Design a binder for this molecule. Structure first.
Ligand SMILES: CCOc1ccc2c(-c3ccnc(Nc4cc(OC)cc(C(F)(F)F)c4)n3)cnn2n1
Length: 338
């Protein structure tokens, strides 16, 4: 796909490529000048010409047509799709241009976490956006910091002596949600596997059936990452991930081990887990109870951790909904009267 385009090329007789914004297994996103919209800069996702990504792209176009007509002012912060077309047999989707992902920001900030005031604002907007999907019988299923994009990524920089780090701070942390190629309607077939290892809910790993609550799980994991700069589940292995969940959040509920067909993770009613193995020693060093990750015992940190704990409830029915999350005390500060 280096083959099919480059800087200076004009796509669909109107979109002049001026930059490549990023690349992925999924394809790439380029920045274009739209010569038929007064020179508006747009993002064009150019989809890898592979069955999986083609199918996801057609699905994304259908979901965004739905969300974007349902919410034409983008009150709920889903990215606006402008149109789509084909280029050398690749699907190309045109979006309003957004800045870099929250992942890429953290990376470019030397994996320093966001300060709590920005986490509060971003968390509220993510919950509100993803709650709009949940209001429209949709589950995103692949939420991650890479899929949350800043509207504008201008920042200030200052030495912080506390951590002896130069630190970037966004001027405006407003976000939009992207990547609707895995989004699943309530009445559609639910894939066995959904989500990216570090954000997968326990009911997904244990194949107990998933729906909107698996997005809540993902968002709790995203907020921990925002807070720390790193995932608290640093693994790609499902069984190790369960072992990390057990160290950070406590024992899996007996009713989830009882029901699961994923007997390969278990020995009787316990995780089939050797604490003394390489992976066992890594899990014991790397993981600890959730509240031990708090950087401050200040009440605003307790409030965030209270919300994260509710989002990381194992039972997906008990798990806080995003409608309830938007009412959580952590967001009181956002509701202080002007
Ligand atoms: C796994 C994630 O997949 C993505 C990722 C980004 C998108 C977009 C999008 C829509 C509007 N504006 C942008 N801007 C953008 C800006 C960047 O730096 C300034 C970097 C990137 C990137 F290429 F790395 F993704 C994108 N991206 C639409 N769909 N997706 N699907």
């Amino acid at each position: 796909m280096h083959l099919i385009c480059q800087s200076g090329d004009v796509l669909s007789a109107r979109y002049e490529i001026v930059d490549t914004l990023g690349e992925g297994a999924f394809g790439k996103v380029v920045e274009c000048i739209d010569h038929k919209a007064g020179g508006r800069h747009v993002a064009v996702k150019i989809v890898k010409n592979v069955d999986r990504y083609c199918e996801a792209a057609r699905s994304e176009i259908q979901v965004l047509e739905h969300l974007n007509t349902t919410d034409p002012n983008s009150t709920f912060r889903c990215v606006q799709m402008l149109e789509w077309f084909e280029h050398h047999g690749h699907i190309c989707i045109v979006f309003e241009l957004l800045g870099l992902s929250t992942y890429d920001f953290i990376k470019e900030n030397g994996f320093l976490p966001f300060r709590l005031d920005h986490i509060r604002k971003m968390a509220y907007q993510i919950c509100k956006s993803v709650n709009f999907l949940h209001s429209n019988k949709l589950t995103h299923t692949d939420l991650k910091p890479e899929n949350i994009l800043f509207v504008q990524s201008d920042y200030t920089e200052a030495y912080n002596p506390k951590i002896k780090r130069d630190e970037r701070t966004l001027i405006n942390p407003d976000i939009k949600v992207v990547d609707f190629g895995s989004a699943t309607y309530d009445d559609e077939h639910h894939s066995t596997l959904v989500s990216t290892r570090h954000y997968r809910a326990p009911e997904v790993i244990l194949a107990l059936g998933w729906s909107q609550p698996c997005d809540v799980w993902s968002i709790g994991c995203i907020l921990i990452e925002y807070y720390l700069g790193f995932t608290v589940f640093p693994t790609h292995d499902s069984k190790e991930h369960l072992a990390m969940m057990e160290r950070i959040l406590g024992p899996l509920p007996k009713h989830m081990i009882q029901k699961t067909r994923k007997r390969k993770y278990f020995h009787h009613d316990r995780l089939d887990w050797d604490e003394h193995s390489s992976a066992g020693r890594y899990v014991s060093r790397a993981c600890k109870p959730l509240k031990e990750f708090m950087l401050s015992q200040d009440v605003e940190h307790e409030r965030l951790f209270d919300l994260i704990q509710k989002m990381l409830e194992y039972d997906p029915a008990k798990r806080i909904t995003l409608r309830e999350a938007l009412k959580h005390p952590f967001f009181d500060l956002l509701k202080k009267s002007i």
